[PDB]
Amino acid sequence: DTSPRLDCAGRILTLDRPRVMGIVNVTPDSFTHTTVEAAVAHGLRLAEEGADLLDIGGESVPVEEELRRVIPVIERLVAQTALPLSVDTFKPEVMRAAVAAGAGMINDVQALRQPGALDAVADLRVPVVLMHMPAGSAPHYDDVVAEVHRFLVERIFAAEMAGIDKRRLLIDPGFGFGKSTADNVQLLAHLPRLCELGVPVLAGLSRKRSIGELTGRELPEQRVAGSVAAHLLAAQRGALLLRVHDVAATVDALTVWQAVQAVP
Amino acid sequence: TSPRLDCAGRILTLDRPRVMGIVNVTPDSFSDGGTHTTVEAAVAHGLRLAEEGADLLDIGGESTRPGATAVPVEEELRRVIPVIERLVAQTALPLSVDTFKPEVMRAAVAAGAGMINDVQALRQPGALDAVADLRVPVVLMHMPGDAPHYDDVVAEVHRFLVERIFAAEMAGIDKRRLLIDPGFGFGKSTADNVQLLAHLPRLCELGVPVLAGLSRKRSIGELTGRELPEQRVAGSVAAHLLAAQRGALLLRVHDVAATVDALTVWQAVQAVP
Amino acid sequence: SPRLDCAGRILTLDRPRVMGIVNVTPDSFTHTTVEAAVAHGLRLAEEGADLLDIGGESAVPVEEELRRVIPVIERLVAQTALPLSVDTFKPEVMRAAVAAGAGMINDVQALRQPGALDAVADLRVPVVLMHMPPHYDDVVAEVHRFLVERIFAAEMAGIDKRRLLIDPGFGFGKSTADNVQLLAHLPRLCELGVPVLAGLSRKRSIGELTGRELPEQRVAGSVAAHLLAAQRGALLLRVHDVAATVDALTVWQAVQAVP
Amino acid sequence: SPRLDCAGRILTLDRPRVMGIVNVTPDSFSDGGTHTTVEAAVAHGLRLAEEGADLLDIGGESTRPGATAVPVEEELRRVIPVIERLVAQTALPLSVDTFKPEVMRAAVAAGAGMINDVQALRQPGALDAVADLRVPVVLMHMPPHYDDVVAEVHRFLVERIFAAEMAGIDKRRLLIDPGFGFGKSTADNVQLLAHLPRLCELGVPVLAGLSRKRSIGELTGRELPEQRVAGSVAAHLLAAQRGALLLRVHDVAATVDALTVWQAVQAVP
Ligand SMILES: Nc1ccc(C(=O)O)cc1
Ligand SMILES: Nc1ccc(C(=O)O)cc1
Ligand SMILES: Nc1ccc(C(=O)O)cc1
Ligand SMILES: Nc1ccc(C(=O)O)cc1
Ligand SMILES: Nc1ccc(C(=O)O)cc1
Ligand SMILES: Nc1ccc(C(=O)O)cc1
Ligand SMILES: Nc1ccc(C(=O)O)cc1
Ligand SMILES: Nc1ccc(C(=O)O)cc1
């Protein structure tokens, strides 16, 4: 009826069409002052490439170590871009410190299952992404689509009962290593069924192993074409946020699709 | 049940969209001519496109881009024939020749080509007789020329292609050897190109395979804001995936590996009940 | 600097000028040969050629040579403003080509064909005298001697010295080593009071120096040879690769213009 | 003839040598949909080695007009994997194009044998790094209007030779580069090439780099960099004729062919 309007601490994200969330990782890789400077420059590049929002993450660690990584990046990007900023964390104290520093959204891989996380997000009144998460083999699911659906309903309801408004919830089926290639494809094929839980859906298949397995592409930067295709397919199947590394390419694909879809 | 195209003995099965790699044989397509021949650069490029997973290669020696100078037949032959001769010996792929000249169609097929991609839809005198004699598949493209305004571009392209299918059948060309192409970019504005892509299912209902070619075209540049053709890859791959979703069975592309990857992810998703 | 009046089309040799090669000879792929040659000549004009050299022999009888070169000359004289040269050693072809619009004659035989001296004297167009003879004791001295003899014979036939050019004849009449000798010693041939034409385009000797077997693989080495020839005094360069040669000469002219 | 010890790989400057340009930037390649930036750069370096390059120059930060600065962690993530792969797969000497001391040390540990510095060691720690590292180093000139561009570039290049001098930077490791394209107009670039023998009279090998540069485009009317090859090869041959012993180029095979013809002619008494 009404397109979702997300107030990310004053920076508005309108989901009248799929929006692109650019990935900004702040994790030392032995190549952290130099890590912070590189993360900020990367966020500015993704903003130039047309990102609708940036997702800043400092994990792959104690709260104080996560804060030393993400807080300087948030403070600099809040000052140097106009984009909504999301922070990737499952720890409530990081959620509170990040929002105080300027973050406007929380992307939580644990779907607020960390003790205190429900109360933090209810207090902070920012949007939150609830992800499904259950290396070696992925777990076996009898019906991955039904299981992810059941889990996300439970987490949506727990968040509402903790006082988090439904209009601030997003869900993410958790494409990636908690699923086999076949289960990731099932979740993508049946994504419209998860879009009917009354909340916007985020899809993040960027450079993931399943894309590599489908296309025979061993390294993450070789998986760009397949990832852009997966994200276009997810948007066609109802996803409203796409979490990507390759921002300019994804924006281009979505723009061509939007022009075609606009024809009656 | 799926169309099987016999391209001079090399079989192309259109049970899913197939990727036609563009092999341009023009001195201007390459910057290494200081120490390379035009033929050898085109052959090396075709071999790379075969390695990237092309299902067929389209070899052309005459540019039909806006503002091109016509290439005389003797020069067109000097470009395409040596490239076909080398690629037929070095690939197992069906090979198409992109030409509107019957003399080149006949010489190219004698050299090993198994398909003709004709931007003039066999309107050059002798082209119908050649294709009927040669018994290879042929792509009939729409173009007004050789930037007009249309009252209804989708209906006008449809009407033209119906007429050319009919002309080809009445010349003795088997209907099972026919393919059609709406001719994205040829005498069409960005808006007309988007209209033709959106309404592409309407052209797939003529019972013949449809080829779509939007690779790095000016319209993709306008839609995405990418001024240089090499910057248009992502937008081109998206356009070709959309065309395949709308019924196109052949995709004529420069960026073969990327297009193959996109189609492969889509095929995996489509294969889920 | 030499001012060459090519049948009304003036070529000023204050710096090296580029002569684009327009071959009209049938190959593995008549009317279609003429159409391709005209198109090629127009392309070389667009690429910056200062003049075009039209040739219908690479044995071809006069009547056959005329069927090749005359239609090409007639079409190019109408569609370009460039001076046009005809590459022939046969006096009857020289006369017909000039009547059709040619403004210069490039003669591999240096007017040694019976009748050639009187034809060119009658026509009042410029002529390039090439050396064609193989082993030499002193190739540079032998070429010099031959070209002096031919310049003098042309003057004694009534061809004004201001219409003469010479060409050492790089190419198959010399070994790679002898071609390199003539290039190194080219300034010595520039002291005969007449402009020198150098033509090393895609020749076997460049290919042998660089290990490039096919003619289009020899382009970089050919452009380099022509820049060296221009540095050593050549005022006309006969080339296939017009745009590339024009580019190299343009960069050299910018550098040479600095005191 | 000068012999450069690039970490065991000897570069003998008995004739002009060709330095092939290996840029490690996502913008330098179009096949990124299915290739990594590193793998495309390594493949390119191997192609330039096959075309006859005498050394490869690996760079991960573009200093062209208006480029955004590249963070050290990102510069390292680009150049180090390319150096590591090329040291294993070619026997050619490898140079790193960087002005950052941290990248110089990491690059040499990964296998680089030479450093090409556009800021002529004006970066704090670079002089100390170069003096510490003791690999050959190219000292380039970079600053716009000049009163006399050749003398001013000459003066600056003298001061940097003097500034470099007496840190343990042996004068036998110094190379200079007048820096075509960096803060110089077409006219100023033509001036420096014409008068290049005057900079060759300092006793250190000289590197010339005009490959596909904007000045070449302006002189020849070639708008796209890939259309500038012929003019670039001519410029590098003029530079070799005027004393340059290193030529930094994109078009290796063409430059090698031009040098091969000139060497055959120059060899005639
Ligand atoms: N100047 C640059 C800044 C950032 C990046 C990057 O994040 O990849 C690359 C270059
Ligand atoms: N494509 C070309 C490359 C190089 C040259 C040249 O060296 O003059 C010319 C053309
Ligand atoms: N040796 C090669 C040269 C060129 C190509 C290509 O054009 O893709 C591939 C291989
Ligand atoms: N052959 C063609 C090539 C390109 C275009 C275009 O860019 O619109 C159209 C036709
Ligand atoms: N359109 C043309 C392109 C090329 C040529 C040529 O190579 O002579 C002629 C015409
Ligand atoms: N460089 C690129 C090439 C291809 C794609 C894509 O297919 O989306 C994206 C980027
Ligand atoms: N195999 C090759 C890979 C890459 C290149 C190149 O980038 O020039 C050339 C050859
Ligand atoms: N690093 C540089 C690259 C290019 C140019 C130029 O084109 O002038 C200058 C410097």
PDB file of N, CA and C in Angstrom, chain C residues 47 180-181 183-185 206 209-210 212 217-218 220-225 227-228 231-232 243-252 254-256 258-259, chain D residues 51 190-191 193-195 216 219-220 222 227-228 230-235 237-238 241-242 253-262 264-266 268-269:
ATOM      1  N   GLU C  47      43.137   9.995 -43.501  1.00  0.00           N
ATOM      2  CA  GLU C  47      44.173   9.727 -42.503  1.00  0.00           C
ATOM      3  C   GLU C  47      45.312  10.737 -42.554  1.00  0.00           C
ATOM      4  N   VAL C 180      69.827  -1.549 -44.892  1.00  0.00           N
ATOM      5  CA  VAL C 180      70.239  -0.806 -43.700  1.00  0.00           C
ATOM      6  C   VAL C 180      71.374   0.162 -44.043  1.00  0.00           C
ATOM      7  N   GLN C 181      72.306  -0.274 -44.893  1.00  0.00           N
ATOM      8  CA  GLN C 181      73.376   0.616 -45.344  1.00  0.00           C
ATOM      9  C   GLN C 181      72.821   1.861 -46.033  1.00  0.00           C
ATOM     10  N   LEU C 183      69.925   3.262 -45.667  1.00  0.00           N
ATOM     11  CA  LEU C 183      69.221   4.116 -44.704  1.00  0.00           C
ATOM     12  C   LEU C 183      70.214   4.891 -43.859  1.00  0.00           C
ATOM     13  N   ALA C 184      71.246   4.207 -43.378  1.00  0.00           N
ATOM     14  CA  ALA C 184      72.243   4.882 -42.553  1.00  0.00           C
ATOM     15  C   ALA C 184      72.916   5.995 -43.328  1.00  0.00           C
ATOM     16  N   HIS C 185      73.193   5.743 -44.611  1.00  0.00           N
ATOM     17  CA  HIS C 185      73.925   6.671 -45.449  1.00  0.00           C
ATOM     18  C   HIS C 185      73.011   7.508 -46.321  1.00  0.00           C
ATOM     19  N   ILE C 206      62.647  -4.846 -43.081  1.00  0.00           N
ATOM     20  CA  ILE C 206      62.134  -4.487 -41.751  1.00  0.00           C
ATOM     21  C   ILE C 206      61.649  -5.721 -41.022  1.00  0.00           C
ATOM     22  N   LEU C 209      64.671  -7.599 -39.720  1.00  0.00           N
ATOM     23  CA  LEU C 209      65.288  -6.952 -38.561  1.00  0.00           C
ATOM     24  C   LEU C 209      64.501  -7.218 -37.287  1.00  0.00           C
ATOM     25  N   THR C 210      63.177  -7.276 -37.384  1.00  0.00           N
ATOM     26  CA  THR C 210      62.330  -7.331 -36.201  1.00  0.00           C
ATOM     27  C   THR C 210      61.700  -8.693 -35.934  1.00  0.00           C
ATOM     28  N   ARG C 212      59.278 -10.028 -37.770  1.00  0.00           N
ATOM     29  CA  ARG C 212      57.845  -9.914 -38.058  1.00  0.00           C
ATOM     30  C   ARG C 212      57.578 -10.426 -39.477  1.00  0.00           C
ATOM     31  N   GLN C 217      52.317  -7.084 -39.516  1.00  0.00           N
ATOM     32  CA  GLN C 217      53.072  -7.151 -38.257  1.00  0.00           C
ATOM     33  C   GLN C 217      54.267  -6.214 -38.303  1.00  0.00           C
ATOM     34  N   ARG C 218      54.573  -5.651 -39.478  1.00  0.00           N
ATOM     35  CA  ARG C 218      55.771  -4.833 -39.653  1.00  0.00           C
ATOM     36  C   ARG C 218      55.497  -3.343 -39.473  1.00  0.00           C
ATOM     37  N   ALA C 220      54.969  -1.168 -36.835  1.00  0.00           N
ATOM     38  CA  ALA C 220      55.807  -0.372 -35.929  1.00  0.00           C
ATOM     39  C   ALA C 220      57.230  -0.196 -36.465  1.00  0.00           C
ATOM     40  N   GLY C 221      57.853  -1.288 -36.920  1.00  0.00           N
ATOM     41  CA  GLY C 221      59.188  -1.158 -37.486  1.00  0.00           C
ATOM     42  C   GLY C 221      59.216  -0.256 -38.719  1.00  0.00           C
ATOM     43  N   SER C 222      58.137  -0.271 -39.552  1.00  0.00           N
ATOM     44  CA  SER C 222      58.097   0.591 -40.750  1.00  0.00           C
ATOM     45  C   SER C 222      57.974   2.064 -40.390  1.00  0.00           C
ATOM     46  N   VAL C 223      57.112   2.382 -39.399  1.00  0.00           N
ATOM     47  CA  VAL C 223      56.970   3.772 -38.994  1.00  0.00           C
ATOM     48  C   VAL C 223      58.297   4.274 -38.442  1.00  0.00           C
ATOM     49  N   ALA C 224      58.998   3.410 -37.704  1.00  0.00           N
ATOM     50  CA  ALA C 224      60.312   3.777 -37.153  1.00  0.00           C
ATOM     51  C   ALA C 224      61.307   4.034 -38.284  1.00  0.00           C
ATOM     52  N   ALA C 225      61.315   3.151 -39.290  1.00  0.00           N
ATOM     53  CA  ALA C 225      62.233   3.327 -40.432  1.00  0.00           C
ATOM     54  C   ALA C 225      61.966   4.639 -41.155  1.00  0.00           C
ATOM     55  N   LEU C 227      60.525   7.402 -39.884  1.00  0.00           N
ATOM     56  CA  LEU C 227      60.985   8.536 -39.101  1.00  0.00           C
ATOM     57  C   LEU C 227      62.498   8.695 -39.235  1.00  0.00           C
ATOM     58  N   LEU C 228      63.246   7.580 -39.173  1.00  0.00           N
ATOM     59  CA  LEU C 228      64.695   7.662 -39.353  1.00  0.00           C
ATOM     60  C   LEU C 228      65.033   8.205 -40.730  1.00  0.00           C
ATOM     61  N   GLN C 231      64.565  11.861 -40.670  1.00  0.00           N
ATOM     62  CA  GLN C 231      65.621  12.538 -39.917  1.00  0.00           C
ATOM     63  C   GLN C 231      66.883  12.665 -40.749  1.00  0.00           C
ATOM     64  N   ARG C 232      67.084  11.736 -41.660  1.00  0.00           N
ATOM     65  CA  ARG C 232      68.273  11.683 -42.496  1.00  0.00           C
ATOM     66  C   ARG C 232      68.072  12.357 -43.843  1.00  0.00           C
ATOM     67  N   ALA C 243      48.065   7.094 -41.154  1.00  0.00           N
ATOM     68  CA  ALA C 243      47.788   7.752 -39.868  1.00  0.00           C
ATOM     69  C   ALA C 243      48.950   7.588 -38.901  1.00  0.00           C
ATOM     70  N   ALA C 244      49.509   6.383 -38.819  1.00  0.00           N
ATOM     71  CA  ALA C 244      50.595   6.162 -37.878  1.00  0.00           C
ATOM     72  C   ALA C 244      51.818   6.973 -38.250  1.00  0.00           C
ATOM     73  N   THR C 245      52.117   7.038 -39.551  1.00  0.00           N
ATOM     74  CA  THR C 245      53.286   7.792 -39.979  1.00  0.00           C
ATOM     75  C   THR C 245      53.095   9.281 -39.767  1.00  0.00           C
ATOM     76  N   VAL C 246      51.886   9.775 -40.037  1.00  0.00           N
ATOM     77  CA  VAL C 246      51.577  11.180 -39.816  1.00  0.00           C
ATOM     78  C   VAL C 246      51.752  11.510 -38.336  1.00  0.00           C
ATOM     79  N   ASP C 247      51.292  10.609 -37.469  1.00  0.00           N
ATOM     80  CA  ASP C 247      51.447  10.797 -36.013  1.00  0.00           C
ATOM     81  C   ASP C 247      52.924  10.883 -35.621  1.00  0.00           C
ATOM     82  N   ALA C 248      53.749   9.949 -36.093  1.00  0.00           N
ATOM     83  CA  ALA C 248      55.176   9.976 -35.743  1.00  0.00           C
ATOM     84  C   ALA C 248      55.871  11.228 -36.268  1.00  0.00           C
ATOM     85  N   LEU C 249      55.571  11.602 -37.506  1.00  0.00           N
ATOM     86  CA  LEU C 249      56.204  12.797 -38.056  1.00  0.00           C
ATOM     87  C   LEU C 249      55.780  14.050 -37.301  1.00  0.00           C
ATOM     88  N   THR C 250      54.541  14.080 -36.824  1.00  0.00           N
ATOM     89  CA  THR C 250      54.030  15.241 -36.115  1.00  0.00           C
ATOM     90  C   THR C 250      54.757  15.417 -34.794  1.00  0.00           C
ATOM     91  N   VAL C 251      54.996  14.318 -34.066  1.00  0.00           N
ATOM     92  CA  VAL C 251      55.749  14.419 -32.811  1.00  0.00           C
ATOM     93  C   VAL C 251      57.196  14.843 -33.109  1.00  0.00           C
ATOM     94  N   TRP C 252      57.806  14.274 -34.166  1.00  0.00           N
ATOM     95  CA  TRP C 252      59.173  14.677 -34.523  1.00  0.00           C
ATOM     96  C   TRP C 252      59.226  16.153 -34.893  1.00  0.00           C
ATOM     97  N   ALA C 254      57.396  18.574 -33.828  1.00  0.00           N
ATOM     98  CA  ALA C 254      57.296  19.396 -32.630  1.00  0.00           C
ATOM     99  C   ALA C 254      58.637  19.482 -31.918  1.00  0.00           C
ATOM    100  N   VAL C 255      59.364  18.364 -31.845  1.00  0.00           N
ATOM    101  CA  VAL C 255      60.659  18.341 -31.170  1.00  0.00           C
ATOM    102  C   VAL C 255      61.708  19.090 -31.984  1.00  0.00           C
ATOM    103  N   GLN C 256      61.719  18.871 -33.298  1.00  0.00           N
ATOM    104  CA  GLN C 256      62.703  19.510 -34.172  1.00  0.00           C
ATOM    105  C   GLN C 256      62.538  21.025 -34.193  1.00  0.00           C
ATOM    106  N   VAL C 258      62.131  23.019 -31.811  1.00  0.00           N
ATOM    107  CA  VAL C 258      62.694  23.677 -30.638  1.00  0.00           C
ATOM    108  C   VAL C 258      64.150  24.025 -30.937  1.00  0.00           C
ATOM    109  N   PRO C 259      64.554  25.292 -30.812  1.00  0.00           N
ATOM    110  CA  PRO C 259      65.958  25.700 -30.906  1.00  0.00           C
ATOM    111  C   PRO C 259      66.748  25.232 -29.678  1.00  0.00           C
TER     112      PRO C 259
ATOM    113  N   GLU D  51      56.437  -9.859 -24.868  1.00  0.00           N
ATOM    114  CA  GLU D  51      56.660  -8.858 -25.914  1.00  0.00           C
ATOM    115  C   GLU D  51      58.054  -8.253 -25.862  1.00  0.00           C
ATOM    116  N   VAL D 190      57.213  19.212 -24.755  1.00  0.00           N
ATOM    117  CA  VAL D 190      58.048  19.181 -25.957  1.00  0.00           C
ATOM    118  C   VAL D 190      59.424  19.791 -25.674  1.00  0.00           C
ATOM    119  N   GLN D 191      59.467  20.855 -24.872  1.00  0.00           N
ATOM    120  CA  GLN D 191      60.743  21.468 -24.497  1.00  0.00           C
ATOM    121  C   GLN D 191      61.666  20.484 -23.781  1.00  0.00           C
ATOM    122  N   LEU D 193      61.696  17.191 -23.848  1.00  0.00           N
ATOM    123  CA  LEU D 193      62.168  16.113 -24.697  1.00  0.00           C
ATOM    124  C   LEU D 193      63.289  16.611 -25.604  1.00  0.00           C
ATOM    125  N   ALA D 194      63.117  17.811 -26.171  1.00  0.00           N
ATOM    126  CA  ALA D 194      64.103  18.367 -27.098  1.00  0.00           C
ATOM    127  C   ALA D 194      65.450  18.526 -26.427  1.00  0.00           C
ATOM    128  N   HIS D 195      65.438  18.972 -25.170  1.00  0.00           N
ATOM    129  CA  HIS D 195      66.635  19.270 -24.399  1.00  0.00           C
ATOM    130  C   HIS D 195      67.014  18.142 -23.450  1.00  0.00           C
ATOM    131  N   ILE D 216      50.786  13.733 -25.936  1.00  0.00           N
ATOM    132  CA  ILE D 216      50.855  13.039 -27.220  1.00  0.00           C
ATOM    133  C   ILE D 216      49.527  13.166 -27.943  1.00  0.00           C
ATOM    134  N   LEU D 219      49.247  16.691 -29.521  1.00  0.00           N
ATOM    135  CA  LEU D 219      50.079  16.870 -30.709  1.00  0.00           C
ATOM    136  C   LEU D 219      49.509  16.121 -31.900  1.00  0.00           C
ATOM    137  N   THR D 220      48.925  14.947 -31.666  1.00  0.00           N
ATOM    138  CA  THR D 220      48.481  14.098 -32.753  1.00  0.00           C
ATOM    139  C   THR D 220      46.979  14.142 -32.993  1.00  0.00           C
ATOM    140  N   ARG D 222      44.685  12.635 -31.143  1.00  0.00           N
ATOM    141  CA  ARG D 222      44.173  11.308 -30.815  1.00  0.00           C
ATOM    142  C   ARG D 222      43.533  11.381 -29.434  1.00  0.00           C
ATOM    143  N   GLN D 227      44.521   5.209 -28.886  1.00  0.00           N
ATOM    144  CA  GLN D 227      44.813   5.720 -30.234  1.00  0.00           C
ATOM    145  C   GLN D 227      46.170   6.413 -30.294  1.00  0.00           C
ATOM    146  N   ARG D 228      46.860   6.529 -29.173  1.00  0.00           N
ATOM    147  CA  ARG D 228      48.080   7.321 -29.108  1.00  0.00           C
ATOM    148  C   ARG D 228      49.350   6.503 -29.287  1.00  0.00           C
ATOM    149  N   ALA D 230      51.140   5.221 -31.946  1.00  0.00           N
ATOM    150  CA  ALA D 230      52.172   5.644 -32.890  1.00  0.00           C
ATOM    151  C   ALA D 230      52.921   6.880 -32.388  1.00  0.00           C
ATOM    152  N   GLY D 231      52.194   7.886 -31.906  1.00  0.00           N
ATOM    153  CA  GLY D 231      52.857   9.077 -31.422  1.00  0.00           C
ATOM    154  C   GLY D 231      53.725   8.775 -30.212  1.00  0.00           C
ATOM    155  N   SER D 232      53.295   7.828 -29.375  1.00  0.00           N
ATOM    156  CA  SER D 232      54.070   7.472 -28.186  1.00  0.00           C
ATOM    157  C   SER D 232      55.383   6.776 -28.540  1.00  0.00           C
ATOM    158  N   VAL D 233      55.323   5.819 -29.470  1.00  0.00           N
ATOM    159  CA  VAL D 233      56.518   5.119 -29.904  1.00  0.00           C
ATOM    160  C   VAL D 233      57.502   6.098 -30.527  1.00  0.00           C
ATOM    161  N   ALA D 234      57.009   7.065 -31.308  1.00  0.00           N
ATOM    162  CA  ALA D 234      57.912   8.066 -31.877  1.00  0.00           C
ATOM    163  C   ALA D 234      58.567   8.882 -30.773  1.00  0.00           C
ATOM    164  N   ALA D 235      57.788   9.274 -29.772  1.00  0.00           N
ATOM    165  CA  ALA D 235      58.362  10.043 -28.673  1.00  0.00           C
ATOM    166  C   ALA D 235      59.436   9.252 -27.944  1.00  0.00           C
ATOM    167  N   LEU D 237      61.325   6.790 -29.116  1.00  0.00           N
ATOM    168  CA  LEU D 237      62.514   6.677 -29.920  1.00  0.00           C
ATOM    169  C   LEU D 237      63.309   7.984 -29.927  1.00  0.00           C
ATOM    170  N   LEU D 238      62.630   9.135 -30.000  1.00  0.00           N
ATOM    171  CA  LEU D 238      63.349  10.414 -29.896  1.00  0.00           C
ATOM    172  C   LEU D 238      64.063  10.529 -28.553  1.00  0.00           C
ATOM    173  N   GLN D 241      67.116   8.369 -28.666  1.00  0.00           N
ATOM    174  CA  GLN D 241      68.122   9.059 -29.471  1.00  0.00           C
ATOM    175  C   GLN D 241      68.745  10.219 -28.708  1.00  0.00           C
ATOM    176  N   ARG D 242      68.021  10.808 -27.757  1.00  0.00           N
ATOM    177  CA  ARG D 242      68.559  11.948 -27.032  1.00  0.00           C
ATOM    178  C   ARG D 242      69.150  11.554 -25.687  1.00  0.00           C
ATOM    179  N   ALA D 253      55.896  -4.262 -27.420  1.00  0.00           N
ATOM    180  CA  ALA D 253      56.358  -4.853 -28.664  1.00  0.00           C
ATOM    181  C   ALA D 253      56.658  -3.773 -29.698  1.00  0.00           C
ATOM    182  N   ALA D 254      55.784  -2.755 -29.800  1.00  0.00           N
ATOM    183  CA  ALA D 254      56.009  -1.696 -30.804  1.00  0.00           C
ATOM    184  C   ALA D 254      57.257  -0.885 -30.497  1.00  0.00           C
ATOM    185  N   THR D 255      57.471  -0.571 -29.227  1.00  0.00           N
ATOM    186  CA  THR D 255      58.653   0.194 -28.845  1.00  0.00           C
ATOM    187  C   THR D 255      59.913  -0.615 -29.090  1.00  0.00           C
ATOM    188  N   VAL D 256      59.871  -1.911 -28.771  1.00  0.00           N
ATOM    189  CA  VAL D 256      61.010  -2.798 -29.031  1.00  0.00           C
ATOM    190  C   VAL D 256      61.330  -2.842 -30.531  1.00  0.00           C
ATOM    191  N   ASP D 257      60.306  -2.977 -31.374  1.00  0.00           N
ATOM    192  CA  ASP D 257      60.553  -2.981 -32.826  1.00  0.00           C
ATOM    193  C   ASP D 257      61.174  -1.668 -33.286  1.00  0.00           C
ATOM    194  N   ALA D 258      60.660  -0.535 -32.798  1.00  0.00           N
ATOM    195  CA  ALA D 258      61.268   0.746 -33.184  1.00  0.00           C
ATOM    196  C   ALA D 258      62.713   0.809 -32.746  1.00  0.00           C
ATOM    197  N   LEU D 259      63.003   0.341 -31.523  1.00  0.00           N
ATOM    198  CA  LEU D 259      64.381   0.363 -31.065  1.00  0.00           C
ATOM    199  C   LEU D 259      65.248  -0.577 -31.869  1.00  0.00           C
ATOM    200  N   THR D 260      64.699  -1.721 -32.311  1.00  0.00           N
ATOM    201  CA  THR D 260      65.500  -2.671 -33.071  1.00  0.00           C
ATOM    202  C   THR D 260      65.918  -2.074 -34.422  1.00  0.00           C
ATOM    203  N   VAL D 261      65.018  -1.342 -35.076  1.00  0.00           N
ATOM    204  CA  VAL D 261      65.371  -0.728 -36.371  1.00  0.00           C
ATOM    205  C   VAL D 261      66.423   0.354 -36.176  1.00  0.00           C
ATOM    206  N   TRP D 262      66.220   1.210 -35.175  1.00  0.00           N
ATOM    207  CA  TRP D 262      67.174   2.279 -34.909  1.00  0.00           C
ATOM    208  C   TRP D 262      68.543   1.720 -34.539  1.00  0.00           C
ATOM    209  N   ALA D 264      69.916  -1.035 -35.541  1.00  0.00           N
ATOM    210  CA  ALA D 264      70.559  -1.550 -36.749  1.00  0.00           C
ATOM    211  C   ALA D 264      71.158  -0.415 -37.566  1.00  0.00           C
ATOM    212  N   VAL D 265      70.431   0.703 -37.674  1.00  0.00           N
ATOM    213  CA  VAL D 265      70.934   1.866 -38.403  1.00  0.00           C
ATOM    214  C   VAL D 265      72.100   2.526 -37.661  1.00  0.00           C
ATOM    215  N   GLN D 266      71.938   2.743 -36.355  1.00  0.00           N
ATOM    216  CA  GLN D 266      72.942   3.431 -35.553  1.00  0.00           C
ATOM    217  C   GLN D 266      74.247   2.659 -35.524  1.00  0.00           C
ATOM    218  N   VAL D 268      75.680   1.267 -37.985  1.00  0.00           N
ATOM    219  CA  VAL D 268      76.451   1.424 -39.218  1.00  0.00           C
ATOM    220  C   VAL D 268      77.463   2.546 -39.005  1.00  0.00           C
ATOM    221  N   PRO D 269      78.753   2.323 -39.312  1.00  0.00           N
ATOM    222  CA  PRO D 269      79.757   3.379 -39.154  1.00  0.00           C
ATOM    223  C   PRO D 269      79.473   4.589 -40.027  1.00  0.00           C
TER     224      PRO D 269
END
